Amino acid sequence: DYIIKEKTVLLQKKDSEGFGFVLRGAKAQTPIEEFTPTPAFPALQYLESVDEGGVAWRAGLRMGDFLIEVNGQNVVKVGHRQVVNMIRQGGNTLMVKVVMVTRH
Amino acid sequence: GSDYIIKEKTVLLQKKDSEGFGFVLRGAIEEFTPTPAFPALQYLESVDEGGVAWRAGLRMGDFLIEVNGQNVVKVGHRQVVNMIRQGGNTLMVKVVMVTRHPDM
Ligand SMILES: [Br-]
Ligand SMILES: [Br-]
Ligand SMILES: [Br-]
Ligand SMILES: [Br-]
Numbered sequence: 001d002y003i004i005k006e007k008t009v010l011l012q013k014k015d016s017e018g019f020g021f022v023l024r025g026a027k028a029q030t031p032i033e034e035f036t037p038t039p040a041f042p043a044l045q046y047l048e049s050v051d052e053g054g055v056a057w058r059a060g061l062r063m064g065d066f067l068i069e070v071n072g073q074n075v076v077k078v079g080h081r082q083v084v085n086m087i088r089q090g091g092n093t094l095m096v097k098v099v100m101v102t103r104h
Numbered sequence: 105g106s107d108y109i110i111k112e113k114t115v116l117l118q119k120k121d122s123e124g125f126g127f128v129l130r131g132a133i134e135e136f137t138p139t140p141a142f143p144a145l146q147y148l149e150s151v152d153e154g155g156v157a158w159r160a161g162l163r164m165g166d167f168l169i170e171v172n173g174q175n176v177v178k179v180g181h182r183q184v185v186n187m188i189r190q191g192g193n194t195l196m197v198k199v200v201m202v203t204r205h206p207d208m
């Protein structure tokens with residue numbers, strides 16, 4: 001039985017800083033296939049690391065958070081490259097909907 | 105934000121010819137993406153108590169993920185219905201029950 005805790009947070013940063021988090025893939029997907037979300041892995045991208053005291057950190061984001069939406073756009077099946085580009089477009093403002101999965 | 109309790113269930117239904125599986129399938133634009141809140145396009149609108157589906161553990165609100173091994177998360181209504189009637193009196197379905205608990 002899974003418990004998925006969801007929330008939408010707003011990240012606001014300065015021009016000379018980053019959002020303070022690193023994104024990686026959930027599993028070792030094969031490039032010849034689309035990602036299939038499951039309760040344990042609801043999104044292709046997840047936060048692999050968050051700098052303590054950084055923008056993402058202060059907003060409540062933590063390692064383990066799965067990325068569901070970027071600036072109102074669903075990115076559950078979207079790759080790293082596109083997500084980075086999407087985040088760039090937003091400049092110093094980034095809205096993300098994330099989920100933390102628990103209880104196995 | 106909200107908490108989403110997720111319970112996945114895979115059952116095997118077997119019915120007589122003088123009966124149906126005992127459920128009303130409803131289809132949730134035809135290009136959607138699964139999210140923890142809404143994991144699939146088709147879901148059980150109704151399930152007859154004491155029916156084949158009911159006795160197997162299926163309940164109103166369950167989202168259809170697979171029909172006879174085939175992922176139907178993003179498949180249309182007519183197509184899924186055909187897949188179900190294909191197996192005849194036998195239907196193996198994987199579903200996910202989602203209950204939302206809003207934050208306050
Ligand atoms: Br899918
Ligand atoms: Br791109
Ligand atoms: Br790309
Ligand atoms: Br969600």
Ligand SMILES: [Br-]
Pocket residue numbers: 131132145179180181
């Ligand atoms: Br549909």
